[PDB]
Design a protein around this ligand. Structure first.
Ligand SMILES: [Mn+2]
Ligand SMILES: [Mn+2]
Ligand SMILES: [Mn+2]
Ligand SMILES: [Mn+2]
Ligand SMILES: [Mn+2]
Ligand SMILES: [Mn+2]
Ligand SMILES: [Mn+2]
Ligand SMILES: [Mn+2]
Ligand SMILES: [Mn+2]
Ligand SMILES: [Mn+2]
Ligand SMILES: [Mn+2]
Ligand SMILES: [Mn+2]
Ligand SMILES: [Mn+2]
Ligand SMILES: [Mn+2]
Ligand SMILES: [Mn+2]
Ligand SMILES: [Mn+2]
Ligand SMILES: [Mn+2]
Ligand SMILES: [Mn+2]
Ligand SMILES: [Mn+2]
Ligand SMILES: [Mn+2]
Lengths: 191, 191, 191, 191, 191, 191
């Protein structure tokens, strides 16, 4: 059994994560940041995890703290659920084409904690994805991946090969991480 | 069962496509353009499709119309044979080394219809592959991929990482698409 | 005793500042601009001040006037609480690493009123930090530091050595100013 | 059964290779060049081969001859163990993240003998990895891959996408080749 | 009491670390890599730690694994000895002039795990410091700092402002980290 | 007791220095070069030294010889007063903001004799600070610092980060050296 429940309570936020690595994409994410919900829902589903995320934070300031605390907690949940990491595929990668965008992620689940994030166009450093609720600043993409990798204690390399639309660029990256994780997480019948 | 028979009759050409996604590489291609036959035969075989292509067109003008009409028909056949696309791997990619050439393709079979074609050296914009029959102008490579993606309604990203020989560059690309499709087409035991 | 209460009432805003230089980080900031609240709370806490800030302004226009009026009032409070500035360390500086960001501030509390703000990446000239309330335009960072220095009548040099995330860049700067002030404010046992 | 025993005796060196393609990572490598031992041990293990390498050569001159003769012999063993190459996956690739380094390899086991090695930073042309024994000059990395590909008669493309540490860069490449081989070597249930 | 004993046993190495944050510079380091011993001895002494390091590793390959495993273990010891980190100075920085070299380090002991290493001249990417024993490749400097920061879970920013001699550049950096840690580790009489 | 009296009599000048490291800023400087007097008075006061400087030299030629002989003598006095340098902070640095100018100095009192002087704008190579008496050529700034460091036998790194006014640039540097010395000179309760 590869499950983890993480409860993270800070001054900024209140997080509950329930994670099953061997799931069927049963995902419910509620952080108060709907685009982030969309991204983590995509992450959970495409990784074929079962994932519940319940988060309430200081979104009056902005999404940052909640986003970061959630990523930390999710990272911790991933590492805990992984356990000894014996007999797994360990390495995984995936390409995600999304209209004009092509993104890629590669992981080593038993490698030293590390994150390299490259290729993301410069305008995503100051782009806001905004709806009727709390907005999402795409500059946080790197932060999410770094927080995930550091707390799951994995090597995570995320690349944007090319792209234009910030929604496409961001979603393709989350999905790339997701499917890279899904491959690496699988039992390896020869290891 | 994931089969399709497409009959496409235009002023320019006459096309019959029989496609089985779950084949064993039983391929017979006859378009009147032998290098194109070679490319679609490679595509069918490396995708592990069963594929019959019968095409007669206005090759007195040049191969373009026949090539395009065939790609459209084949795309339509791929989309039809795919059906609802439920329970499939959906995403697929493949690297094809061919001597000095390295090509890559990535697909999303349930993504919006889109094609990105990059990295092909500039001389392929005006290169002709010529034998004893109707020649093949490599500038058409992009056209084929665009027609396939638009009519199969899939996201197809084809890259040449590097290469020199136009035959190698072209064949590696068709083979990359082929094996990307083969991976994406597979039943996914977790979806 | 090094305390000051400043009441500043303009057409744009209504400000009350209570400041104790020799505090324990007892801080409550409410300006109607939650990210600014976060920044001044960080400033008060890391400076080891006791600080209460109550501000209501024309946030329907934007945060600018409130932010500026608050910084002016806080500057005035700092200068008043400083008094004759006898027997204090006078000079102070601090480095603040915050993930990828490194910020620095240096102060001369008995120097001529002056502010130099350098190194902040160009995208912060047009970046918005936005939550569920009144947003914060990072272009105002310099304005805050200039208003503080001019009204406290101190020399304040704020540098960003490098950074990417606008939240990190901004917070590291406020914290750098805070800890620079804390050092400079201390009694000097040899002066 | 896909096994090979190669004995290679030249003026420069004395090599014994025992290879099983369908192994469990039972690896013992002893060439007199300990970093090279480390690399071939990583290669054997990550390829899921069973591999024994016993080599004694003119390491008083330097590691080159031994390294090259070993790579030639290992290549020959790989080609011999492959046999007719019927019913195998044929193509294989793998990404290896190693801290700051990302490496990639792609193979065609039934392609013409060819090696392309790109992306390795310029300082590896003159870098030495040195311990208490015979050192390893990283300039030899390309030589190893070229010798392997030429003697196994396979198409091998090795890329460094980025990296800094010569140990990371080198090991990630050997591991990339290893896992590319492992994928390509697998029986293909549809071919 | 702020002490930690860490025993780390991997396939590559065997490490014992005894650390006292509140020491008097009683330091004994023995890793089999004498320049590394010199660096960690400088680190322990200038941080005013009491530190014993006993390490035996695969130095026949090179110093890398031993160096890295030691840095990981030392990082873990630092984090464990830090405990809840309550009432400490938290932030610390130091400049180290060493002949022509000026180095700097800044830390946040309660910040998120992060390392930024900048300014080191390009020739240190391929420089070897060699004596009568196992040599030290200066490219590993960054690796050490990254491993320390990641495992101590601290924010560590190391800069070389300028320098020429690789021994000076390296030692000044270790000493900068040391004295930055010493400052940050101190009890803060106001926190 | 950390005091020194140096009498230096050359053909060019006649110098008497009385120095107390553990002073209260009781400073009297008279060299016949009033801006230099101002600089050494700032140096003595901000270092919290007790310092008397009496110098008469060949100011008819220019200030150079007197300035240099004074710096040599003062350096010698600093080194002599330092003694064995046991139990002192050893390292010290300070930032000095002065209107538009930011200067910095870092010292190692037990390091090898060395001086690095950087960042001073090019116009100070030929700037004269002139009053009603003997003028001061700012090109001499570097000379002063080099003479101080060489004769005190200390490592002294002086940087101008930025600035415009030659008076500000010069004074900020002397003050930076002063406060760097003051920090480094202090007893270290842990060494
Ligand atoms: Mn953050
Ligand atoms: Mn970047
Ligand atoms: Mn690629
Ligand atoms: Mn979407
Ligand atoms: Mn057309
Ligand atoms: Mn183009
Ligand atoms: Mn061909
Ligand atoms: Mn204004
Ligand atoms: Mn500017
Ligand atoms: Mn914050
Ligand atoms: Mn050779
Ligand atoms: Mn080359
Ligand atoms: Mn290794
Ligand atoms: Mn390493
Ligand atoms: Mn760099
Ligand atoms: Mn040394
Ligand atoms: Mn001179
Ligand atoms: Mn110069
Ligand atoms: Mn600086
Ligand atoms: Mn003055």
């Amino acid at each position: 059994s590869r499950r983890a429940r993480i409860e993270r309570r800070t001054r900024e936020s209140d997080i509950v994560i329930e994670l099953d690595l061997d799931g069927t994409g049963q995902v419910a994410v509620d952080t108060g940041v709907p685009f982030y919900d969309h991204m983590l829902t995509a992450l959970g589903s495409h990784a074929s995890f079962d994932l519940t995320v319940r988060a309430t934070g200081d979104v009056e300031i902005e999404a940052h703290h909640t986003i970061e605390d959630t990523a930390i907690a999710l990272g911790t949940a991933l590492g805990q659920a992984l356990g000894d990491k014996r007999g797994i595929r360990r390495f995984g990668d995936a390409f995600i084409p999304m209209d004009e965008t092509l993104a890629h992620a590669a992981v080593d689940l038993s490698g030293r904690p590390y994150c390299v994030h490259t290729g993301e166009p410069d305008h995503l450093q100051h782009t806001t994805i905004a709806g009727s609720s709390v907005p999402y600043h795409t500059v946080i993409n790197r932060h999410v991946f770094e927080s995930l990798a550091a707390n799951a204690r994995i090597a995570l390399h995320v690349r944007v090969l090319y792209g234009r639309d910030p929604h496409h660029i961001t979603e393709a990256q989350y999905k790339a991480v997701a499917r890279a994780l899904r491959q690496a997480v699988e039992p390896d019948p020869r290891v």
